[PDB]
């Protein structure tokens, strides 16, 4: 004589996930460095057409 008891705790109504992401607050830090013209990279064509990854 073997028994198979199934005890029920409570009834929960969870939500199924699909698309998730991690967010949060951020505050950048500005760093400036003025360079004169005709000195190293101080030119009129290097500041305008400047890439955001170099």
């Amino acid at each position: 004589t073997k028994f198979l008891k199934i005890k029920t705790v409570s009834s929960e109504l969870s939500c199924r996930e699909g698309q998730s992401y991690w967010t949060g607050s951020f505050s950048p830090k500005c760093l400036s460095s003025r360079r004169c013209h005709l000195v190293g990279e101080c030119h009129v064509n290097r500041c305008l057409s400047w890439r955001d990854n170099e």
């Binding site: 400036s32 003025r34 190293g40 990279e41």
Partner: protein, 301 residues
């Protein structure tokens, strides 16, 4: 960057007490020679901060120019028995240096001149924390940091390091961490003011201007290549001097216009002389600002 890479104004001496074995090519420092304590500073992809500002003096050059004082001892022995003073200040620094080196100078906490010395013929390792037995050994030191010396008269003793949430940064100790401690390899710049200590900062903001000091002006004589000439001999307005010199509006606006009786053609530097830093909102001129690579021990509890 700066076009003047090997030309060093003033004295240009790069030798420390105990390792005076390279004065034949590093005293002074010119385009020729082979100075082990200066060739590694102009390497691409290694110390870009030194390549950005190259018209000013270095650390040893600032020591020889009566700007940066010397520690005690100035060059500790990294092999002597019964310990050595240059140990705790070196194990906390995570820097790399090539082989065949015997000395490696850096900056202490009091802003003086603290370095190490290896007796011949003992070479260093990859990290430089300990020496070992033995191509050719370098007859000089290796700069463990990336700072440049300059002359300033701005007081900053009350501007102590205010790095919040950090137990021990670099070498200095803010407090005694008794609970938790987070050890990580992070890069933090530093700055040294007049009559202060090695103050650490988060962000670095540079500033380039000019003045009326002779260090902000260069000149060359005309003779039968490029030949350097002492610009300090240019007389002032209504004063005296030695050899005359002339130039454009920038050089003539500072000294006296001679032209017909001048012996050289003076010019203006490519933005050098006064380098100020943005700290506490205001603008102050440091003495030996750099950007080293050490180990920062942040808090947790």
């Amino acid at each position: 960057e700066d076009p003047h890479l090997r030309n060093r104004p003033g004295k240009g001496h790069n030798y420390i007490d105990g390792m005076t074995q390279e004065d034949a090519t590093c005293k002074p420092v010119t385009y020729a020679g082979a100075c082990s304590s200066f060739d590694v500073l102009l390497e691409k992809g290694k110390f870009p901060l030194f390549q950005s500002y190259a018209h000013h003096r270095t650390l040893l050059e600032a020591v020889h120019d009566t700007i940066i004082a010397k520690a005690d001892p100035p060059s500790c022995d990294l092999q002597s028995a019964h310990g050595n003073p240059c140990m705790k200040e070196k194990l906390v620094m995570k820097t790399h240096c090539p082989n065949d080196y015997q000395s490696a100078h850096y900056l202490n906490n009091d802003g003086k001149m603290a370095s190490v010395k290896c007796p011949p013929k003992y070479e260093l390792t990859e990290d430089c924390n300990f020496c070992r037995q033995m191509a050719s050994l370098k007859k000089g030191s290796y700069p463990l940091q990336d700072l440049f010396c300059q002359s300033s008269e701005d007081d900053g003793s009350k501007l102590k390091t205010k790095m919040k949430g950090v137990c021990e940064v670099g070498v200095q100790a803010l407090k005694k961490c008794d609970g938790q401690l987070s050890t990580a390899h992070e890069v933090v710049p530093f700055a040294v003011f007049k009559n202060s200590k090695k103050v650490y900062l988060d962000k670095l903001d540079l500033k380039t201007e000019e003045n009326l000091l002779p260090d902000s002006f260069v000149c060359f004589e005309h003779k039968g290549e490029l030949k350097s000439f002492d610009i300090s001999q240019c007389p002032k307005i209504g004063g005296h001097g030695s050899k005359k010199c002339t130039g454009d509006a920038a050089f003539c606006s500072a000294y006296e216009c001679t032209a017909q009786y001048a012996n050289a053609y003076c010019s203006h530097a490519n933005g050098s002389g006064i380098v100020q830093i943005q700290v506490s909102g205001v603008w102050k001129k440091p003495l030996c600002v750099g950007y080293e690579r050490v180990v920062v021990k942040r808090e947790l509890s």
